[PDB]
């Protein structure tokens, strides 16, 4: 599992 | 080829809930993360949730967060979103998009789109 | 949020003209990791699912036509089309993919003149 790139 | 096909758009009351679906061949589902676009009656596209490729983080726009509730099943092909105390003001065409992990360039895959109506 | 602003509202066009319309961002869509502005613009078709032209806002996406080139940095970016043809008339909306939420621009709707 990995997160957005728009999550910053 | 990739392809995003989506159900469950139908006329509800407010305050109701309704559940969509959308299912993805042609890639594999399981890698990438997937998100739920809305396009208004006024036009105007909006994003709605976006859920990672695995299932344990979930975005959601401030407007939604609360009521609607974004899942995929990696083992059935299938991204959803349940949604509940539907406002009139979430009426629209909701489209899954994939999500791109690896280019991380945008929206390039859309599906057909859902109709989704509120009103008493 | 970043807001998105998309002048003009329309654009009468013949075509074979050069056409220009903007994007501002309220805030810089710069994503230092990639070194790439993280703006994406789309066009729509009536019925149809938008249609990604342009990301990271010059790379021109595999299928789109020569003509469409994007173009700017930091908050202000456009897209320009050199020799702008009939199938090209649609709305054009730019996004912010740089941070949640994703927000899109009104629309630019391209028209014909006559």
């Known amino acids: 599992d990995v997160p957005d790139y728009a999550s910053l | 080829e990739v392809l995003l096909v989506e159900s469950g758009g139908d006329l509800v009351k407010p305050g109701g809930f309704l559940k969509l679906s959308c299912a993805a061949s042609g890639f594999t589902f399981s890698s990438f993360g997937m998100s739920w676009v809305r396009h208004t009656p006024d036009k105007r596209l909006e994003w709605v949730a976006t859920?990672?490729?695995?299932?344990?983080?979930?975005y959601y726009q401030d407007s939604v967060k609360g009521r609607f509730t974004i899942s995929r099943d990696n083992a059935k092909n299938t991204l959803f979103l349940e949604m509940t105390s539907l406002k009139s003001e979430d009426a629209g065409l909701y489209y899954c998009?994939?999500?791109?992990?690896?280019?991380?360039?945008?929206?390039?895959?859309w599906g057909r789109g859902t109709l989704v109506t509120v009103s008493a | 949020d970043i807001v998105m602003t998309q002048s003009p509202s329309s654009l009468t066009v013949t075509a074979g003209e050069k056409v220009t319309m903007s994007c501002k961002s309220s805030?810089?869509?710069?994503?230092?990791?990639?070194?790439?502005?993280?703006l994406t613009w789309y066009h729509q078709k009536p019925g149809q699912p938008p249609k990604l032209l342009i990301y990271w806002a010059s790379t021109r996406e595999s299928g789109v036509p020569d003509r469409f080139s994007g173009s700017g940095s930091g908050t202000d970016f456009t897209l320009t089309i050199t020799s702008v043809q009939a199938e090209d008339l649609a709305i054009y909306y730019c996004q912010n993919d740089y941070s949640h939420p994703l927000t899109f621009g009104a629309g630019t709707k391209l028209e014909l003149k006559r």
């Open positions: 998009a994939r999500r791109e992990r690896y280019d991380e360039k945008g929206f390039a895959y």
């Open positions: 859920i990672s490729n695995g299932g344990g983080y979930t």
């Open positions: 805030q810089s869509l710069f994503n230092s990791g990639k070194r790439k502005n993280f």
